[PDB]
Amino acid sequence: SNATAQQWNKDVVGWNLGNEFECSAPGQDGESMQIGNPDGSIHAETAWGNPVVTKKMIQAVKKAGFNAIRIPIRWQCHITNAQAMSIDKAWIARIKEVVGWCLDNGLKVIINVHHEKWLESRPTYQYKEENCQKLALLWMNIASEFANYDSRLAFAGTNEVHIRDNWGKPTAENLEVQNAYNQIFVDVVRATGGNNAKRHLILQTYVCNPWFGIENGDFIIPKDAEGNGNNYMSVEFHYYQPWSYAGDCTYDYWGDAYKDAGKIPADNEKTMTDFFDKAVNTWSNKGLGIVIGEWGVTDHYKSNSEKVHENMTYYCKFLTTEARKRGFSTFVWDNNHFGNGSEKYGIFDRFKSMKVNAPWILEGIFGK
């Protein structure tokens, strides 16, 4: 099988297996940059309160209408030799079990390197050589283990690279190191040859904020293997935008369509389509795919949950449809957390037979 990035992304409407395989080892600091294989780390998927992932969980996501799953994976607490970045065999086996569940049930898959804090938290010249060496070694091991899987499996090299507690624009130094991460990733995966020569590779903008890559060549398109051009790579960003609606609950409503229902952000439907057009002109028109690797609106309302949830349906339908019609793939964030406030991105209740607890989201993505 052989699919370009744009072909791979076409009509992909996906879902994130959030707060599972990227949790830290039980009882350990998620911000730790230590590399090792501490006792109990094979149980990391339960370390932040979520359950062990089962096949029926994967099958329920498929049956809801999703056709791809993004699997966040942290590796730093599953390393048997920090110098070689060798991976615990039991951890590889567990990941392959879940990847196989997805592939066997008609889902495309993204695996990545996620919350890998020695890498994400140190994008500086001080650590550039060490981090590029370790990332090279880590991806050599991941790419080798997953080399025989078909084109439905894509690799995303990193997640959100940034100085701890700093979500703003990178320095020139930060951006140089983080662009180097992307090139090292492409280099070592293509060097494993075989099926990995044309696998879909997914590269991140700085802290997955598209505005930190889309101007001035800030995001450097890597040099891929001879002949591939840009056709087998995507640019990934995350798009919880506008954050004042989707993330921090400043606004309960969004869009000129709901301007009479309550206060809305200045960022509206046109802001979003203007941005999506900019991504087409800047990246898609150079042959690259576009992956919206995370998006979503936290469940929040000060009152009138019916109208707020109707507006979220509108937002979900608008974002996913306008992205899809430009050829992007999208992956909604889901952390199995329910409530009213921040970080409430759960859709399916993973503790209760994947009951749909946020039907307003699925009605927006797939229809009533």
How far lies 346's CA from each of 113, 229, 334, 356, in Å?
Answer: 22, 38, 5, 9
First CA to last CA distance, the chain: 35
In contact, 333 and 345? CB cutoff 8 Å: yes
Q: What share of the chain is helix, strand, coil (3-state, %, to 5)?
A: 40, 15, 45
Secondary structure of residue 256 in the 3-state scheme:
helix
How far lies 13's CA from each of 126, 175, 293, 327, 366, in Å?
Answer: 39, 30, 10, 11, 9
Q: Beta partners for 233?
A: 201
Resolution (A): 1.6
Q: How far apart (Å, rounded) are the C-alpha atoms in residues 77 and 79?
A: 6
CATH number of 5-366: 3.20.20.80
Residue 204, Cβ neighbours under 10 Å: how many?
A: 28
Annotate 198-248 with three-state secondary structure. CCCEEEECHHHCHHHCCCCCCCCCCCCCCCCCCCCEEEEEECCCCHHHHCC
Following DSSP, what letter does each residue of 75-101 receive, concatenated? Answer: -GGGEEETTTTEEPHHHHHHHHHHHHH
Q: How far apart (Å, rounded) are the C-alpha atoms in residues 70 and 98?
A: 11
Cis peptide before 242, with omega less than 30 degrees from 0? yes
Please, what is the Cα angle at 283 between 280 and 289, to 5 degrees? 90
Q: How far apart (Å, rounded) are the C-alpha atoms in residues 303 and 358?
A: 17
Buried b (16+ CB within 10 A) or exposed e, 16-30: bbbbbbbbbbbebee
**Dihedral angle of Cα 214, 174, 20, 146, to the nearest 10 degrees:** 80
What residue spans define the domains of the chain? 5-366
Phi-psi region of 95 (alpha: psi -120 to 50; beta: other; left: phi over 0): alpha
For residue 213, which of 161, 165, 248, 265 has the smallest C-alpha distance? 161
What are residue 188's phi and psi, to 5 degrees?
-75, -35
Quick one: DSSP state of residue 164? T
The residues annotated with a catalytic role in the active site are 114, 160, 294
For residue 334, which of 20, 8, 12, 13 has the smallest C-alpha distance? 20
What are residue 13's phi and psi, to 5 degrees?
-125, 105
In contact, 341 and 24? CB cutoff 8 Å: no
Phi-psi region of 245 (alpha: psi -120 to 50; beta: other; left: phi over 0): alpha
Secondary structure of residue 156 in the 3-state scheme:
strand
Q: How far apart (Å, rounded) are the C-alpha atoms in residues 112 and 223?
A: 20
Structure tokens at 293: 């690797």
Strands (E), the chain: 13-16, 68-71, 79-81, 86-87, 108-112, 153-156, 201-204, 233-238, 289-295, 329-332, 348-349, 355-356
